[PDB]
Amino acid sequence: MNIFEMLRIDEGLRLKIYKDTEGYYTIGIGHLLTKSPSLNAAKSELDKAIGRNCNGVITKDEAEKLFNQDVAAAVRGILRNAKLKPVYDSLDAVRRCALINMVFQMGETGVAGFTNSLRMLQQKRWDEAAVNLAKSRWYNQTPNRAKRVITTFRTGTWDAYK
Ligand SMILES: [Cl-]
Ligand SMILES: [Cl-]
Ligand SMILES: [K+]
Ligand code: NA
């Protein structure tokens, strides 16, 4: 298991524009297009992202390309963030994937606001961190996914994805 396989499980793969769990137009493997309620705006974002007139439809290779870019952007985001980078650097390879997963889903700024959870993770207080992480809108809105990510943080294993 690796970050690509992990996020592929959590995000799915859909080749037509669809609405994510927040009601936002998305495509591929969790590629957020826009928060605009306009499908035309989402179609314009898609064509810009792919570099052709897609009419709301892409290929798997195109989906995978956006996914590679988006995973990299999540990791870049962490490394450039003053609150996330020290936690990331303190973690093992498996728990780093849990943090990347959270940033992929909710963005750099949003995960950086989990100040108390991040401190617990830095302190390697894994059970305490797991408890704190669940006291969140994130957990309540996407509980099965949050439970998987939280188990990854608690254990440093892939048991929730195996
Ligand atoms: Cl709560
Ligand atoms: Cl869920
Ligand atoms: K297609
Ligand atoms: Na999704």
Q: What is the residue extent of each domain of the chain?
A: 1-162
Please tell me the experimental approach by which this structure was elucidated: X-ray
Distance from the CA of 55 to the center of ligand 3, in angstroms? Answer: 10
Six-digit token pair at 125? 């207080």
Q: Is 47 a catalytic residue?
A: no
Using CA atoms of 32, 38, 41, 43 in order, give the dihedral in degrees to the nearest 10: 70
Q: Which amino acid is at 62?
A: E
Cα–Cα distance measured from residue 109 to residue 74, given in angstroms and rounded to the nearest whole number? 11
Q: Which amino acid is at 4?
A: F
Six-digit token pair at 159? 């048991």
Compute the C-alpha angle 52/100/7, nearest 5°.
60
Distance from the CA of 34 to the center of ligand 4, in angstroms? Answer: 14
Asked whether residue 36 is marked as a ligand-binding residue, the answer is: no
Q: Is 1-162 a domain of CATH 3.40.50.10860?
A: no
Cα–Cα distance measured from residue 87 to residue 23, given in angstroms and rounded to the nearest whole number? 31
Catalytic residue among 10, 11, 62, 70: 11
Environment class of residue 15 by beta-carbon count within 10 Å: exposed (0-12), middle (13-18) or buried (19+)?
Answer: middle
Contact 6, 159 (CB under 8 A): no
Q: Is 70 a catalytic residue?
A: no
Query: Which spans in the chain are helix H?
Result: 3-11, 39-50, 60-80, 84-90, 93-106, 108-112, 115-122, 126-133, 137-141, 143-155
